[PDB]
């Protein structure tokens, strides 16, 4: 972008909204690309700062959610804390 | 990247797996960033080519899924086909 930012809460309401719309599209585009390149099925659920709902699924949201409920093994599960841990361990790359 | 690639299925098995691991992390990193910048809560559910499950939630998947079941209002819902259409429009 025109200037480097740090990852922290945006307090300006207008900027928050603009950033949300742009980065939401960017996230769905990366999901699309991963789904096609690697033959994945993907769902994404987003609640904004007022808990309005936005969703994406590569093909069919209901199919992905029901497969989730049918899965009965341990699997990779991450949160923001895991992402931060990976960033702390990774190189400047 | 060193070259532009077409968005189509990778048939080389090694390359598919390398690409999957790298881009899965990239997608989760962008989700972390959006969650902090814009004060939102996000979940991701991924089934790979082998039908193995990978998940991410900014804080708690249980809470996101329960809230999802309560939401009644019309809302944005997009699929790959919609993304492809937007990219046509963008040119």
């Amino acid at each position: 972008g025109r200037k480097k930012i740090q990852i922290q809460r945006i307090t300006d309401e207008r900027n928050r909204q603009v950033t949300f719309t742009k980065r939401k599209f960017g996230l769905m585009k990366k999901a699309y690309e991963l789904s096609v390149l690697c033959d994945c099925e993907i769902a994404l659920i987003i609640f904004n700062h007022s808990n309005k709902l936005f969703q994406y699924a590569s093909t069919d949201m209901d199919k992905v959610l029901l497969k989730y409920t049918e899965y009965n093994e341990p699997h990779e599960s991450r949160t923001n804390a895991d992402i931060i841990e990976t960033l702390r361990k990774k190189g400047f790359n | 990247g060193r070259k532009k690639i077409q968005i189509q299925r990778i048939t080389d098995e090694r390359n598919r797996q390398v690409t999957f691991t790298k881009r899965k992390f990239g997608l989760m990193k962008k989700a972390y960033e959006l969650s902090v910048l814009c004060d939102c809560e996000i979940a991701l559910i991924i089934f790979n080519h082998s039908n193995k499950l990978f998940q991410y939630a900014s804080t708690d998947m249980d809470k996101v899924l329960l809230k999802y079941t309560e939401y009644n209002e019309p809302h944005e819902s997009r699929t790959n086909a919609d993304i492809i259409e937007t990219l046509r429009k963008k040119g």
Binding site: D62, L66, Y68, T69, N72, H75 | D62, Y68, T69
Partner: peptide, 17 residues
Amino acid sequence: WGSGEVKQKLQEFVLSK
């Protein structure tokens, strides 16, 4: 994804549509 109430509620929600 496992035996519990959250799993049950999500399944019911999807199927009722």
